[PDB]
Write a protein that binds this ligand. Structure first.
Ligand SMILES: NC1=N/C(=N\Nc2ccccc2)c2ccccc21
Length: 330
């Protein structure tokens, strides 16, 4: 089998992407944030504290004839931005883009933190990291991809995120029309539960490529590109007036600037992030100071190839017995 679904930016800055997912019988369609940096499929629901729901579409398990409460199971997660959510668990039928999994753990939120409530466009998360990170207790549950994998034509999924435009998540096949050149594959470590790999270096604009190993994670659920302070300083030094602002929480730059591109290495291959991808707009409405899309990883503790980087590529998440990651230009 295969599946194919369109993924859409939630706003004009590509702060995150949502993909429609069918849950239950009859189907209840919720727009989920597909997240290769976590491993829980959780949803706003009829169980979510009413004051914590503000415009999201909810899953109502009592209206699904295929829903079953997973007895005794609870979940609780927190994310890199300090947000969190928790609740109980059902199993139900879940379909993405025509690919169906029966008996998928659907984690129903009883509580969500303010950042989730405040974002009416995201109805929950669909985790696509390794199932060793799943938070369900006392019996850890499998991701949608792990449950689907054996049925798929090939044990892979691909992320093709758009810049200010729709894109695609495919399951079970590689669309050879969706990228240019070849796909370069690189090794993955699953020891931290992430799609963790080592970039071979970087360049800033038309500058020379610096060969240096950068270990980090391919995380579709992180918006920005988080890299070592040395690399980030070298990038922003090429932007007149850019500075690291402790009050704002990172590098900012004049909104009037034209940003240089940023290149990262995948083996001997190179992925070029155009400068415009690195502009996250005014820090506050009407300001002429703009937030940068490349930020230091010193605070978060891991380098993160988030959407800023991934949307410049066609990315293969290869779930073969030994997982690997593939990157192509597009
Ligand atoms: N996969 C995720 N990464 C998130 N934040 N990452 C981050 C990195 C550095 C600084 C701040 C946040 C996040 C937030 C909500 C749901 C999923 C995720």
């Amino acid at each position: 089998s295969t599946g194919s679904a369109t993924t859409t930016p939630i706003d004009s800055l590509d702060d995150a992407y949502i993909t429609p997912v069918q849950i239950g019988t009859p189907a209840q369609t919720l727009n989920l944030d597909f997240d290769t940096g976590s491993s829980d499929l959780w949803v706003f629901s009829s169980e979510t504290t009413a004051s914590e729901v503000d415009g999201q579409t909810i899953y109502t398990p009592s209206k699904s004839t295929t829903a079953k409460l997973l007895s005794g199971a609870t979940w609780s997660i927190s994310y890199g931005d300090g947000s969190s959510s928790s609740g109980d668990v059902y199993t139900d039928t879940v379909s993405v883009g025509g690919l169906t999994v029966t008996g998928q753990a659907v984690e129903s939120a009883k509580k969500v933190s303010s950042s989730f409530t405040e974002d009416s466009t995201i109805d929950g998360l669909l985790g696509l990291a390794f199932s060793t990170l799943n938070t369900v207790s006392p019996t850890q549950q499998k991701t949608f991809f792990d449950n689907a994998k054996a049925s798929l034509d090939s044990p892979v999924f691909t992320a093709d995120l758009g810049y200010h435009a729709p894109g695609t998540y495919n399951f079970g096949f590689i669309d050879t029309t969706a990228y240019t050149g070849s796909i370069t594959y690189t090794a993955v470590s699953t020891k931290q539960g992430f799609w963790e790999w080592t970039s071979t270096g970087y360049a800033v604009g038309s500058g020379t490529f610096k060969s240096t190993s950068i270990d980090g994670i391919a995380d579709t659920g992180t918006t920005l590109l988080y890299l070592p302070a040395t690399v980030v300083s070298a990038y922003w030094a090429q932007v007149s007036g850019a500075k690291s602002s402790s009050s704002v929480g990172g590098y900012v730059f004049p909104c009037s600037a034209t940003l240089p591109s940023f290149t990262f290495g995948v083996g001997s291959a190179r992925i070029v992030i155009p400068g415009d991808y690195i502009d996250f707009g005014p820090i506050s409405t009407g300001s002429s100071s703009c937030f940068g899309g490349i930020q230091s990883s010193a605070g978060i503790g891991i380098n993160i190839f988030g959407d800023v980087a991934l949307k410049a590529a066609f990315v293969v998440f290869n779930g073969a017995t030994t997982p690997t990651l593939g990157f192509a230009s597009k």
